[PDB]
Design a protein around this nucleic acid. Structure first.
Lengths: 172, 79, 151
RNA sequence: AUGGGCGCAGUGUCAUUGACGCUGACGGUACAGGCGUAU
């Protein structure tokens, strides 16, 4: 009920799997088991306006494990692009993911998330993170470890979907 | 207010260069102190001259006439 | 920096190191590290080019290590990549030696090779511009030799 | 009027927590003072 199809794009288990697990259990995974293809997880929030369900498709970010690849995006209702601020390469790969997503999903909200900002060694400075600007993506610095801005992307997506700009998540 | 008091207060507030230390240290302090003493002397002589010292005509020499000539230069040229 | 053990270490580990480096590079999963790859390969090849490695790496053939290295790399890649055209490997190795002093061009060359290995290319080399890429490699090697001589 | 190389305070460039300065509301509350000198 009141569920949306969400597609998560980025390097496999480079934060997408960790992010999904952290929102699921609350634990912060340490191991890096690169995601295989995609895993679909229910993920429920409670807003001032009732329950909300995300059908998060944590997709694999490694080509060898891409599997169906863009086929996962079919019928997607929202998209979360990810990248690790500690590695510029995963940032330069961002435009490719955006291209593929828009190509499959022409008009969908997009959140550009910089994962694991908590790790002190930040390579992709906040100054250079600009692709969202021209593409009109909603940006967030996040970190699944310390939960910095841990909820901002999901809250923004829920607001953009339901249409309530002032909608707020609730504990229960 | 009187010139003697102002000059004495000026000369009192500047400590003489410390004779202690090396020759070169004392001499560099002496040079800086003498430059600042020349500055102080210039200021004191300016005070000694008078309490206004300057006319305001420099302003029209810079802005009032540089505004009035172009005020005359104003041209409708329509619109 | 340690000359005495340098030759022994080279003879012991050079081919193994190149094997593993190439197995990594051809792997797309490690693409982000290519700069370091480019950083080290260009170094080692330069060492090979200047002959600072003195001993022949083939006990059965005391020839200059450069040509032996070329045959060994070609054989290794061809065995690992049977579907590739031999001329492609020849061009790629030639560039490796020619580009060992241009890290950006070297990295783009490695990326070009990685693009190629992804493709089962038939005898049709028309799309490959092998002559144009060979001319570019000749120009790059000419600049490299000019730089070396200018020293 | 002059600014040296480092005391490190913000950092721009690249191979970007490494290197050159600029720059930092800095390590500096420091240091340099013509080549006898009365400019």
């Amino acid at each position: 009920q009141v569920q949306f199809k969400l597609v998560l794009v980025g390097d496999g288990g480079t934060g997408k799997t960790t992010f999904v697990k952290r929102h699921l259990t609350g634990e912060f995974e340490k191991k890096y088991v690169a995601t295989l293809g995609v895993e679909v997880h229910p993920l429920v929030f409670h807003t001032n306006r009732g329950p909300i369900k995300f059908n998060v498709w944590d997709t694999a970010g490694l080509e060898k494990f891409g599997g169906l690849r863009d086929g996962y995006y079919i019928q997607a209702q929202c998209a979360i692009i990810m990248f690790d601020v500690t590695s510029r390469v995963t940032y330069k790969n961002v435009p490719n993911w955006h291209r593929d997503l828009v190509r499959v999903c022409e008009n969908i909200p997009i959140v550009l998330c910089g994962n694991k900002v908590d790790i002190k060694d930040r390579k992709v400075k906040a100054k250079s993170i600009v692709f969202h600007r021209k593409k009109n993506l909603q940006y967030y610095d996040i970190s699944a470890k310390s939960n910095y801005n841990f909820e901002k992307p999901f809250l923004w997506l829920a607001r953009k979907l339901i249409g309530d700009p002032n909608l707020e998540f609730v504990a229960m | 207010l009187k010139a003697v008091r102002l000059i004495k207060f000026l000369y009192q507030s500047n400590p003489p260069p410390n004779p202690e230390g090396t020759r070169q240290a004392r001499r560099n302090r002496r040079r800086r102190w003498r430059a600042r003493q020349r500055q102080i002397h210039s200021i004191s002589e300016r005070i000694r001259s008078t309490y206004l010292g300057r006319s305001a005509e420099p302003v029209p020499l810079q802005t009032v006439d540089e505004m009035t000539k172009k005020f005359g230069t104003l041209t409708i040229d329509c619109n | 920096q340690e000359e005495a053990a340098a030759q022994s270490f080279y003879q012991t580990y050079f081919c193994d190191i190149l094997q593993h480096i190439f197995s990594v590079v051809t792997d797309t999963s490690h693409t982000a590290g290519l700069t370091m790859h480019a950083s080290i390969l260009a170094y080692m090849f330069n060492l090979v080019e200047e002959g600072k490695i003195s001993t022949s790496l083939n006990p059965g053939n005391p020839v200059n290590n450069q040509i032996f290295l070329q045959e060994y790399v070609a054989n290794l890649l061809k065995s690992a990549f049977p579907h590739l055209q031999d001329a492609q490997v020849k061009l790629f190795v030639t560039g490796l030696f020619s580009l060992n002093q241009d890290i950006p061009a070297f990295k783009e060359h490695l990326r070009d090779f990685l693009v190629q290995i992804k493709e089962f290319a038939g005898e049709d080399t028309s799309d490959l511009f092998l002559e144009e890429r060979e001319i570019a490699l000749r120009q790059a090697d000419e600049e490299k030799h000019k730089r070396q001589m200018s020293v």
